[PDB]
A paper describes a structure:
The AAA+ ATPase [name] ([name])/p97, known as cdc48 in Saccharomyces cerevisiae, is an essential and highly conserved protein involved in numerous cellular functions, such as regulating protein homeostasis, endolysosomal trafficking, membrane remodeling, chromatin regulation, autophagy, Golgi formation, and others. Its core function is to unfold ubiquitylated proteins in an ATP dependent fashion. Previous studies have established that post-mitotic Golgi reassembly requires presence of [name], as well as two adapter proteins, VCPIP138, and p4734,35. [name], also known as VCIP135, is part of the ovarian tumor protease (OTU) family of DUBs, an essential family of enzymes that remove ubiquitin tags from proteins to regulate protein homeostasis and function.
Two-dimensional (2D) class averages from initial cryo-EM data sets revealed the typical hexameric structure of [name] with additional blurred density visible at the carboxy (C)-terminal domain of [name], indicating significant conformational heterogeneity of this region. To stabilize the complex, we used BS3 chemical crosslinking prior to grid preparation and cryo-EM data collection. From this sample, initial 3D reconstructions revealed two binding sites of [name] on [name]. We obtained a consensus reconstruction of the [name]-[name] complex at an overall resolution of 2.3 Å (see “Methods” and Supplementary Figs. 2, 3 for details). To better resolve these regions, we used symmetry expansion followed by focused refinement, with masks focusing on the N- and C- terminal ends of [name]. Using TR-FRET experiments, we assessed the effect of nucleotides on [name] binding and find that the absence of exogenous nucleotide behaves similarly to the addition of AMP in the complex, suggesting our complex is nucleotide free in line with not observing nucleotides bound in the structure. We also observed that the complex is highly dynamic, including within the N-domain of [name] and throughout [name].
Residue numbers in the entry:
A (entry chain A): 253 to 430, 436 to 718, 724 to 774
B (entry chain F): 22 to 430, 436 to 588, 593 to 718, 724 to 774
Write the structure that this text describes.
């Protein structure tokens, strides 16, 4: 669609080469078809030759077993090289991944410009839904924003299928009741019922794909930590907002930072917030992914990750648990080996090879800064160490408000008081309290609905019993509230930070 | 016009019964037994008895395939329903067999087929109607070429029921009942409904879809173990929708010479194009287009590319749906699963006990089974049987009966009808079964209920809140803006009903239940096949709503010692799959572990098995319920006081109570066998009855309690209680009151 739209809007002649179609033809006929396509593009220049499923024609040389396949790949390379004489003919080609095709095609003069379409974000999904529902008559009930937010893992073909499924659900509903009359279609409409049913029946095709998008988190979602906000700004926003200042003062922007602190205190929230403030893409590498690379010895994939971060820049590449592999080896005492491991070694290799001009910022997070490999805290690496402590009262209030944003909460509740009485609670604990309150409210609502329906059953002869989460709901939820971070863990983190700070003497330094 | 009604699938198998929804006969003013002359296409009339039912929709009329065919209508069509009081009885009806259906049956065809039909059953018969009599083990079609009070008559004992020989030739516009239909398919009612909803609109209303201008389903990939009748499903869908059916056989295509295979594929797609709307079924798709790695020759890749090209070119073909059969989604080239290709998918899977019973009824439909057989018992005992396996089992039972008859003794139909299969034959066939899907993962709604495990009311409430509420009240969760919990972790002494609890909660929500035992996790760990975890979750995703149960999450931790950390490859993959699990899908993860201490902490984080539920040893009421459930299928003397037995079994796990019940049952069996041996020995020594032990007596339970052991020591209970108390003590802040 992108290639055809570009050709149509620029007025260029569009020629489509389907890889499977080329490979379907007998030996020699594939070469003839490729040559004829390129000749036709030459004749109608300016032209765009779009090769769909390029990996079908020219996969990795290992995947090309037959001699005719290699001959076809060589013919494609020859045509790409001969483009030099072919006046203003551009060849676009679709592929699943850059490594899916023969590397010889990615050389200069051949497919050298590359664009990663990737997966649409919530805004992108909303745009796609609006495009595919343009003709569709939709009831005022449907808000495509909610569908876009809920359609994670969809690519656009998935969204088109979802819209078609909703339309067909509506048509099925209105078909048994009733060449076909367009008045029925105008009357026909789709509601959130149809769209939610389609969402339930939809099978996203890009759930495994890495998410690369600007996070919707903001500094308000995590109050307090103003000093951490300032440090993150200086380390991410300034190099991208004011490269001129860094050039003038001749400083190299820091490549990354390492968050350390109690679990579930908002390190991920902080990384997403700083990515959002700079409107930079955010890539999250969770601890399970690092452990998957370590167990499977797939540390090569680390390179791919960084490529992704390089491809979508400026970026905040976030490693949720850098100590995950260290813990998996024992961590506190570990095995007989040292702190170095294959996956973290590859991370260091990629960080060293990162061009600072690309504005890709690495943020590591760890609840065990002691067991992190020291080689990653060196200059030119995650040199800065930032302590993310347990949220303070203002931070707790902000976290509670952020959690209770999609939940209708009675004005009677004093979130300020609740935050006041939750000293020592991590953000995870506050989220647990809010979820418990929502659980109690939902249970009360369902029980009241059951009682009402039973009353109707016993008496054939309506308002929401509980439309909001009430003061009593939170009071009950606080009974199950627990502090996941004990005072001993806080002491450990405070001792680590104090050890780091004590070495920072020489503060009584003054020029003469 | 009230007479307009939509044809629908029948429940009752009678060929002259049309069911109607309860609020509709009154509107049309019927009498639950009145003769109604339904009108269909081609100016076809069929007179039938109108029954009543609840499941039927107000505007829907349930019709069996025979009445549908003689009315020249299909499911979803519109027919005119109106009473036919002028249905007076008749004197002579000239029925005649169809040539095809009696091609090899010799006999009277009356007192065997036409007599049991119409006997004590006043079936209204219209001239030209074709009715099916399923007797012996054939299904004979009989066409009424003449009735004395034409066109409609009622068969009565005072009727000639005249018939002759010379079977007539089936006319062009007659769809032989031997053709596959939805009634010929069992064990995939859910998947069959999915496929029907997918393909009915594009096929039943092609031009309406074209003017519609919305994307139709192009490729439907039915996977599941072989023998589940996927070809049967496709053929039935094509027949019931009137769509042209073209069968492409993978091996047949690959057998042809290079180029001839391409020509065959192209010609198949062209033929489907011509006779649109059409269904192209590609049986054994993996044969044509396996994983590219499996494909070696140039011709193989060329034929795969040709198939992809045809699938992509479907866009210009008039309402042609391509269905393909495969063992697993990964068995075929990934390029086939792209959009514009086999993007729609259905997992037929192995049938469940209900599905197995449906299949057995379908395959024994013609069989003149003895009254002794209860197909429910066979369906319950045929675990691991695909539809093909059950067909083979029914065939083997019939062959056993035929062999016995031949030993007692082109063939007379009377003895064939007399020939009856008994539960002895079915059990013999079950012994010589060799099911083909014993190792396939079982995905079904468990039959366990909360009654099988009494007590644990708080655990019942938690499980309900965590599983039933999100699937039964999504609106509430949306309103309150809560994300349903992804899963829970049961912990407690072994054999205390954790599996029972998971199965019970799955049953209450009528959700599929997938059990992953500790040996499976250890197999993935030892073989380093943790990738299989993904497949498991995929399966669970395919069967949503589902309760994915991990019986021993600590199995790998135990296998490692219970020097490294708690992380391991298999549990790491479980974490990865759980994180990538969309909460919109109602897949609920339940983990069970006798050793919560050695469980990887990463699994207990929010967004994972965050809730920890302690399943203690059964209390007295739970013990009574466990004893009752264990002995449900065992004849137990009324003298036994299960309440007293539960009272005296404090500290016993559910496994211990099951052991006691099994010990008593085995003692009773031993006593029965010894008494029978003694009785036959006496008969031999004194040739010269009643069951010596018809039930498990109280003495048997008293003897069994001698060997009764407490599998869970007080120290283990202390450990679990200490764990629970450590969890609880952290949950302070109870004295929190808003100002």
């Amino acid at each position: 669609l992108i290639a055809r739209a570009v050709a149509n809007e620029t007025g260029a002649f569009f020629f489509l080469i389907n890889g499977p179609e080329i490979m379907s033809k007998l030996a020699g006929e594939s070469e003839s078809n490729l040559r004829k396509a390129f000749e036709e593009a030459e004749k109608n220049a300016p032209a765009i030759i779009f090769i769909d499923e390029l990996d079908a024609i020219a996969p990795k040389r290992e995947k090309t077993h037959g001699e005719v396949e290699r001959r076809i790949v060589s013919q494609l390379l020859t045509l790409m090289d001969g483009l030099k004489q072919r006046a203003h003919v551009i060849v676009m080609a679709a592929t699943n991944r850059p490594n899916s095709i023969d590397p010889a095609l990615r050389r200069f003069g051949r497919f050298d410009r590359e664009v990663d379409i990737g997966i649409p974000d919530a805004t992108g999904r909303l745009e796609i839904l609006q495009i595919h529902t343009k003709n569709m008559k939709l009831a005022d009930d449907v808000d495509l924003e909610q569908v876009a937010n809920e359609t994670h893992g969809h690519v656009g073909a998935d969204l088109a299928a979802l819209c078609s499924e909703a339309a067909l659900q509506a048509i099925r509903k209105k078909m048994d009741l009733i060449t076909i009359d367009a008045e029925v279609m105008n009357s026909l409409a789709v509601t959130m019922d149809d769209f939610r049913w389609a969402l339930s029946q939809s099978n996203p095709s890009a759930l495994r794909e890495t998410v690369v998008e600007v996070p919707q988190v903001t500094w308000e979602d995590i109050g307090g930590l103003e000093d951490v906000k300032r440090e993150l700004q200086e380390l991410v926003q300034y190099p991208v907002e004011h490269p001129d200042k860094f050039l003038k003062f001749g400083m190299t922007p820091s490549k990354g930072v390492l968050f350390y602190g109690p679990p579930g205190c908002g390190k991920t929230l902080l990384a997403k917030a700083i990515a959002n403030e700079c409107q930079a893409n955010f890539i999250s590498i969770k601890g399970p992914e690092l452990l998957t690379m370590w167990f499977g010895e797939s540390e090569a994939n680390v390179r791919e990750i960084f490529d992704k971060a390089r491809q979508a820049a400026p970026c905040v590449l976030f490693f949720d648990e850098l100590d995950s592999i260290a813990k998996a080896r024992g961590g506190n005492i570990g095995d007989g080996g040292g702190a170095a491991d294959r996956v973290i070694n590859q991370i260091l290799t990629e960080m060293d090879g990162m061009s600072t001009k690309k504005n890709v910022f690495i943020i590591g997070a760890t609840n065990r800064p002691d067991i992190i490999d020291p080689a990653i805290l060196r200059p030119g690496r995650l040199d800065q160490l930032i302590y993310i402590p347990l949220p303070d009262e203002k931070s707790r209030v902000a976290i509670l408000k952020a959690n209770l944003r999609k939940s209708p909460v009675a004005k009677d509740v004093d979130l300020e008081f609740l935050a006041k009485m939750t000293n020592g609670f991590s953000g995870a604990d506050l989220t647990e309290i809010c979820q418990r309150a929502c659980k109690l409210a939902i249970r009360e609502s369902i029980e009241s609905e059951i009682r009402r329906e039973r009353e109707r059953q016993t008496n054939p002869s309506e308002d929401d019993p509980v439309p909001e989460i009430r003061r009593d709901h939170f009071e009950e939820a606080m009974r199950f509230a627990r502090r996941s971070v004990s005072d001993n863990d806080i002491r450990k983190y405070e001792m680590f930070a104090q050890t780091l700070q004590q070495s920072r003497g020489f503060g009584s330094f003054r020029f003469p | 016009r009230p007479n307009r009604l939509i044809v629908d699938e029948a429940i009752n198998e009678d060929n002259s019964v049309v069911s109607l929804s309860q609020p509709k006969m009154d509107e049309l003013q019927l009498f639950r037994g009145d003769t109604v002359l339904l009108k269909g296409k081609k100016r076809r009339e069929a007179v039938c008895i109108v029954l009543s039912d609840d499941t039927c929709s107000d505007e829907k009329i349930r019709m069996n395939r025979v009445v549908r065919n003689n009315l020249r209508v299909r499911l979803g069509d519109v027919i005119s329903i109106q009473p036919c009081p002028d249905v007076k009885y008749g004197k002579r009806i000239h029925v005649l067999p169809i040539d095809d259906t009696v091609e090899g049956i010799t006999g009277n065809l009356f007192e065997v087929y036409l007599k049991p039909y119409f006997l004590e059953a006043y079936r209204p018969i219209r001239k030209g109607d074709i009715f099916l009599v399923r007797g012996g083990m054939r299904a004979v079609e009989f066409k009424v070429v003449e009735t004395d009070p034409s066109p409609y008559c009622i068969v009565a004992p005072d009727t000639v029921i005249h018939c002759e020989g010379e079977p007539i030739k089936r006319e062009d516009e007659e769809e032989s009942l031997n053709e596959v239909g939805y009634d010929d398919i069992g064990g995939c009612r859910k998947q069959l409904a999915q496929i029907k909803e997918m393909v009915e609109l594009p096929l039943r209303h092609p031009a309406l879809f074209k003017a519609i201008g919305v994307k139709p389903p192009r490729g439907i990939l039915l996977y599941g173990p072989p023998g589940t009748g996927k070809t049967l499903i496709a053929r039935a869908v094509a027949n019931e929708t009137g769509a042209f059916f073209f069968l492409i056989n993978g091996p047949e295509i690959m057998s042809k010479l290079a180029g001839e295979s391409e020509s065959n594929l192209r010609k198949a797609f062209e033929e489907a194009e011509k006779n649109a709307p059409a269904i192209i079924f590609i049986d054994e798709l993996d044969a044509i287009a396996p994983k590219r790695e499996k494909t070696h020759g140039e011709v193989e890749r060329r034929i795969v590319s040709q198939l992809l090209t045809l699938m992509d070119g479907l866009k210009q073909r008039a309402h042609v749906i391509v269905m393909a059969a495969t063992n697993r989604p990964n068995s075929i080239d990934p390029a086939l699963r792209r959009f514009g290709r086999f993007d729609r998918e259905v997992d037929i899977g192995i049938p469940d006990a209900t599905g197995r019973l449906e299949i057995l009824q379908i395959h024994t439909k013609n069989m003149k089974l003895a009254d002794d057989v209860d197909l429910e018992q066979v369906a319950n005992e045929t675990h691991g049987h695909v539809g093909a396996d059950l067909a083979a089992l029914c065939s083997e039972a019939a062959l056993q009966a035929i062999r016995k008859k031949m030993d007692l003794i082109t063939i007379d139909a009377e003895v064939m009808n007399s020939l009856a299969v008994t539960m002895d034959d079915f059990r013999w066939a079950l012994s010589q079964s060799n099911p083909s899907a014993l190792r396939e993962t079982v995905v079904e709604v468990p039959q366990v209920t909360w009654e099988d495990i009494g007590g644990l009311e708080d655990v019942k409430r938690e499980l309900q809140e965590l599983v039933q509420y999100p699937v039964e009240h999504p609106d509430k969760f949306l309103k309150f803006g809560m994300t349903p919990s992804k899963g829970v972790l049961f912990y407690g002494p072994p054999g205390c009903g954790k599996t029972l609890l998971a199965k019970a909660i799955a049953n209450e929500c009528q959700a599929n239940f997938i059990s992953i035992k500790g040996p499976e996790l250890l197999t993935m760990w030892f073989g380093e096949s943790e990738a299989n975890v993904r497949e498991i979750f995929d399966k669970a995703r395919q069967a949503a709503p589902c309760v994915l149960f991990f019986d021993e999450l600590d199995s790998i931790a135990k296998a490692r010692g219970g020097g490294g950390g708690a992380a391991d490859r298999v549990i790491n993959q479980i974490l990865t799959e759980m994180d990538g699990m969309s909460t919109k899908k109602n897949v609920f993860i339940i983990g069970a572990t006798n050793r919560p201490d050695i469980i990887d902490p990463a699994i207990l984080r929010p967004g994972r098995l965050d809730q920890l539920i302690y399943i203690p040893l059964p209390d007295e009421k739970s013990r009574v319920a466990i004893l009752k459930a264990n002995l449900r299928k065992s004849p137990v003397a009324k003298d036994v006081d299960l309440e007293f037995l539960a009272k005296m079994t404090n500290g016993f796990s559910g496994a211990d109570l099951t052991e006691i019940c099994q010990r008593a049952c085995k003692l009773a069996i031993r006593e029965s066998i010894e008494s029978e041996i003694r009785r036959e020995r006496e008969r031999q020594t004194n040739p010269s009855e009643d069951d010596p032990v018809p039930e498990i007596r109280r003495d048997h339970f008293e003897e069994a309690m001698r060997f009764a052991r407490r599998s869970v020591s007080d120290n283990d209970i202390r450990k679990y209680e200490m764990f629970a108390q450590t969890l609880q003590q952290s949950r302070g802040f109870g004295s929190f009151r808003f100002p």
